[PDB]
Structure formats: C-alpha cells, structure tokens
C-alpha cells in the first residue's frame, strides 16, 4: 500500500473522474504513460466494488483480471441476439457492482462492446439504462492496430459498424465518456522521439525531420551477435521463421521445457510458450515483471550457461541488456474470477486455474500485435512481407525507443506513415470537446 | 577374453565352420538362441581380420559394427548397374579382408545382397565370382518378416526375385553356404510355448493346442496398471498413437529430453527416440544392455519419481518387471567404421559419430518390426488392426514368451498363424541337405 506515483495534473484529473464521480471515462496513453500504474493504484486503494477485465486471456492474467468472455459467459461466436439467452453463472452479481474497468480497450471490437452494453443493460443495477447504470472505465492505447475482421465478416460488418474500433460502436456514442489522455512519459530518456511521433500524428512532419529519418535505412542487412535487435513482423509466420532460423545455424544443446496446466487454462492464451526451446546463446524476452526487481516484461536477454539443478527445479541464466546474468526460474500465472461474497459487502476474486512455465520466449523477432505496449531500444522494422497495410507504420514506429536503435530494413519512409485517421478523427473530436 | 559360453554341439559346429574353415555359413536362431553370444565370442577371440556389418544403423550400433551402406558407400537408391561406378572410400581394403559377417540378415533384401556380391566381385581379394573370394558369415532369424517392397517397385521386383528374402537372391544360389541352425532354447525356459510354436512351424499343431490357445482368446481389456503389457501393432502409426493415448490421459508433468549428436549420425535409425517426452508413471522400454548388469535390451519398466538431482544430469527412476528402482542416465552410442592399418596389419575400427540420450522409449505399444529379436512376458496381440499380413501372425506369436502371458485381442484366429512358407521351403531344403 504505497504512494510513490507522482500525482500530476492528468493523473489527478483521471483519478478524480474515477473515484469520486460515477461517470464513464476513457483514459489513454501511448506507451509509457502510467496506464497500468493509474489503473492499479485505483485498483488497490478503492472500496468501490469494482471488476477489472481485459480482452484476451494474456492481458487478463497480466492485470490479474477476468478475460471478459469468461466474465460474461460469452461464447466465441456471441452475437447481439444470442446474448439475450445467456444465463449468468453468478446472477446475484451485477446487481451490486458499482464500476467495471476494461484495460487495453484498443483491441475490443465494436460488436463485443455492444454485446457488453446489452448484457449489463438487462442484468445491471438499473435495467434499461446504459450498462445498467454501472460506471464504465476504459483504459487503452488508441494508437493501435484496429481489431481484425475476417474476410467473411467483412461484407456485413462494414454495413453495421463504420470501423472495427470500439469507439465506432453504437453504445459508445449514446453514452458520454469523459476523456483523459495521459501525456507524461515516465522513466523515459526518449527525448525528441515522442515529439517526432506526435509530429507524425499531425501534419507537422517537417520533412527535413522526415529525412532526418531517412538517415537510418542502412541495410547492408546486418546486425551483430551482441546488439539484441528484434524483428517486428506483421504476421506470426515471419516472426516464427526468424526465431527458428536463428535457432538453427546455432550449435550447442537444446533444452525443451513443457508448461504445466493445473485446474483449468486455455492453450492459447499462454503468457510463455508451451514448449520452451532454448539453445546456448539464444536471444530471449522476459514476459513478466520480476518481483525481486531485476527484469521487466519485455526485458531482452541472451541465454547463457545453465547450471543444472540442485534438488529444486532447474534455472536458465540470462545475460540482460545491462549485464546482467540473472537466474530465471519458472513463474506461476493464475486465472482469477470475480464474485460477490454474500457474507460481507465485498467482491472477492477466486483463482480457478494455475499455469507454470519459464517466463521467456525466443526474441530474435516478434510480431507487432504480440508486442502491444512495449518499447525496445534496438529494433528492425522488417519487410511486410505480404502487405504493409494502411496505418501499420505509425504503430511499428511507436514500438521503438530511440532513433539511433531503429534500423529500417526497407527505406520506404513516405506518406502513409500517418496514423490511421479514423483514430485521428476520434482524437480531434474528444480533445476539442 | 571370457570363457562362459557352454559350447554346445550346434555352437561348436558353428564356430568350427567359422574359424578354421573359410566357407560361407548361414546361422539361424529363434532369438532365445546364442546368436548374439556366438557372434561376439567369435568377434572378440579371433585373429582373422574380419569386418562385421549390419543392415540398419540401429543394428550396427548395437553390434558395434558398420552399416552395409556405410561400408560399401552405397547410396540409398543403389542398383546393380550403379554399383559398378562406386569408388571405394578405402580401396586398399577388401584386398586384405579374410571374412565378412552380416548380422540380422533376415532383413536384407535380395537386390542389396546381389549388389554386395557384385561389389566384392569387382574389388575383393582375388576378385573372381564368389564375392571376390571373401568368406561370408550370415547370422539372423528366418522366422521374421520379409523386407518390405513398396507398391511401385513391386511390379518389376516380382519378376526378378521370387521373394524379397535374401535366400531368393541370385548370388546365394551359386554360393557354397553351410547351414547351422541354433535350435536349443537358452533358458528363461520356454517350456510349453516353444513346443507349441515349433508345432505351428511344422504345421503339426494339435487342436488340443488350438483349444488351449483358444483359452486366452478373450474379449475385453486393461493392464493391471503396474503389470507391464505391450500392444504389438503392424504399423508405426497405430502403435505410436497408443503410446500417445496412454501418455495424454495419465496425469502429472511432462519432461522433454533431446538427444545430442556429435560428429555424424542419422535421424532415421536412432536407438532412443530423439525427443523423449516422459511423464511420471510412464511405461518405458530400457532399450540397451547395461554393462553393470541391471537391465537388458527390451526389459520393460514403468517410470517412477524422477529424482532430478544434478550437477551434471538428472536421473529417471524406473520400476522393472521384477521389483524395482533403477536410476537410468543417458547412454553413449558410437558409430564405427572399419579400416586396414598396415602398421598393425589388421582391421581397426575408428568411431566417426556419437549419440547421447537416455536409453528409453514409451512402451505401451510398439511395432513387430521394432521388436525384432525380443520376447515379452505380457503381450497384447490386436487384429492388425485388420487382417495383418499373409504370415504376420507367426512373427507376432514368436514375440511372446509364454502362453499364460500372451493376450490376444480377439478370438478370430481360425487358422492363419501358419509360417510364411517361402521360409518353410528354404528351411526344409537346407535341414535335409
Ligand atoms: N503516473 C506515473 N507516476 C509515477 N510513475 C510512473 C507513472 N507512469 C509511469 N510510471 C513509471 O513508468 C513505469 C511504467 O508505467 P506503466 O504503468 O507500465 O505505463 P503504461 O501502463 O502506460 O504502460 C512504471 O514502472 C512507473 O515506475
Ligand atoms: N552359448 C550360450 N551359452 C550360455 N548361455 C547362452 C548362450 N547363448 C545365449 N545364452 C543365453 O541367452 C541370452 C541371449 O543370448 P543372445 O545370443 O543374445 O540370443 P539372441 O542373439 O538369439 O538374441 C544370453 O543372455 C544368455 O544368458
């Protein structure tokens, strides 16, 4: 229960809208703003009978949340008509809930948002009113690739929703959300990078500074066995090839570790891959924040000599960016579920599942979607390799930390870097309202 | 320099034909016989500058010998025409060789035998017609299945060779081959079963023994969990799926061990599987002979708690058929290659490859072909599934030890056990010559 979080104007304004008011609110930052920090400070220090949810199972386990389809008992094929037949597991709850938070709201499609509103409108405190009158708190990175919509759905989805963004859902317009944008980049020496990114957001590109970009299209391929460059790909398939090809053409023995599921857990979504295949000298990424304060979620390293085990489970030493030769051991992930405790006036969260695996994954290459909400010091913006579609360039650039660590494989650097101005329309509406 | 071999008439007659004479010889056993015993006693205690070969890489590593393709530089697709263009790696050798042994000759197809004869006809010591004069010693079990012949090659193979068995090759006919059959059953004592099996051999079975066979012809199932049983299948696909089905169902944690290849080896013929996926409580097969004298090749067991005490490597504790608790650790297999050294005026064997892996594999089900030369106390004979072969039943029955341990999946059985009388013809020719 600590207080070491630097309460600035935006932070204090957001907490004001959150706790003392019961208004629907939308808080955005871009990577470093304190989205998880603000959410969790509210989460720990409130008595407001709240429920914290997240779109994916990976996002839910990280925030210790409830994996929304599970919280509402939504089948993978849910629709605005089938939602009406859903019987709540925990019917007694959603009458008592005062507020509900949703993290990483960027990747919640419009149809699912409308299903949520209908569900809370029928089972909420005040039925008929938006969300049953329950205060809704949205937290996410607007500067994100919209939720994909398969080719089959495309024809009629285009006719129901203007965009797969959550903010183009009919329920979001009929309800008023106070807008708060986190602008402060904490623990960030990324000076002039965010100014460049904000310049790319607007029409202020200052193409002298655009060609100040044109300086880092080096090719000559290459990297180093030391410089920890990560490839950002558009699809799993390409990231999956770079991980394997780098894993091959590499000597030493491979070590394979199988994740263990206790209780109930889906595969996917797993934070760490189920089969951890590590050779000596393998570039890896750590997928959780260390309690002991040694590495963070996304801290890259290089697998080094494993000492083998004493009578406990074996460890994987890793050579971090700064040093560091840290012993990584398997980490326990838990899958929560919120419920009301009839005994007292409180909503408790029991754990229905456990998952055990080394918190690491091969980190020679990653996909943009997998790297949502992460910044890497040295990145490689690789080939498409089948379509570099509209507005994917601003997101990929927003994955980087500095310009002197950015290497652009293809020197494309042209006039569709622009953030995909559906978002831009939404932001210019709310910032000036 | 061991002398513990109890040199029975058959044995002394076979060694006499081997050592003092230079005649081609054909020794057959029934896998309880002294085949490996005779081969290794001759191998160790001789001064005859010989070369020991085996068809597969697995059979070669077990006998500490070389594969036929490796010794002759035979490409996987060799034909009798292309053999003439093969340049020997070690041309100088095959002038010095006095004898050549070939173990597990049962699984040597006719075309390969003719290629061997042609090669030694061209490069051998005094390279005339009979293998270039090199004395050939063949050792194998005739009671095993013939070497498979793909459907494509079948049409024209059928017209050149009457059967894919080695004795229907050409060379053999114009080859003086003394015949010795090890018929005496080396104990573990085979009392009722070998008499019944030999009765099926000579088609002299009695319907008293058919009815006494029909007694273990029962429907239903299950293995008594401890009680070790195995399902002998016709195909890898069926047997290996049963190993997976028993492995998924059973609870606990998975442990994955990767074999390490040093130098040069093969991925097709490995003694232990390359990826050992082992759960606690899993039936295993202990697939090599322990020097310390704790378990034999084929001695089945059930994995019990794996004590991962390390500062080098962890140990897999296994409960044998009698008892038990043996610590199984990785075993080193080596791939030899013979060469002639004028300095010692003899045939030395250097090791060009090494393979390290725990000598274990899941043993809920294995294929007849994999289990060549083995007897198991408790066997489950399925239907193939389906109608196994013309003559697969006799081999499957010859895999068993006793009738009070053989369990036949289904009573259909009517009479198709009969030995594959191409073998019967050959055996009645040589036994009465
Ligand atoms: N508002 C803030 N006050 C104090 N520290 C912050 C704040 N925002 C970010 N930080 C620092 O930055 C780090 C990452 O913040 P985080 O909450 O993960 O940002 P986001 O959730 O936007 O990714 C935290 O470890 C914290 O130390
Ligand atoms: N000549 C022999 N003298 C004594 N015991 C033998 C002899 N041959 C075989 N045995 C017994 O049979 C076992 C297997 O013999 P082996 O040569 O491996 O048979 P095969 O080659 O037919 O599998 C040996 O462990 C041994 O105890």
Residue numbers in the entry:
A (entry chain A), B (entry chain B): 1 to 433
Give excerpts from the publication:
Pif1 is a DNA helicase belonging to family SF1B of Superfamily 1 (SF1), which unwinds dsDNA with 5′ to 3′ directionality. Pif1 is involved in DNA repair and is necessary for the maintenance of mitochondrial and nuclear genomes integrity, in the regulation of telomerase activity and in the replication fork progression.
By testing different subgroups, it was found that indexing in spacegroup P21 with unit cell a = 113.138 Å b = 129.29Å c = 113.68 Å α = 90 °C β = 103.4 °C γ = 90 °C gave an acceptable MR solution. This spacegroup harbors a strong translational non-crystallographic symmetry (tNCS) and twinning with twin law l, -k, h. An unambiguous solution was found in MR with four molecules in the asymmetric unit. The nucleotide binding pocket sits between domains 1A and 2A but most of the interactions with the base involve only domain 1A and the N-terminal tail. The adenine base is stacked by an aromatic residue of motif IV (Y183, Y186 or F187 in DdPif1, SsPif1, and BsPif1, respectively) and a hydrophobic site chain of a residue of the N-terminal tail (A4, V5 or M4 in DdPif1, SsPif1, and BsPif1, respectively). Most of these residues are interacting through their peptidic bond, K28 to 735 for DdPif1 and A31 to T37 for SsPif1.
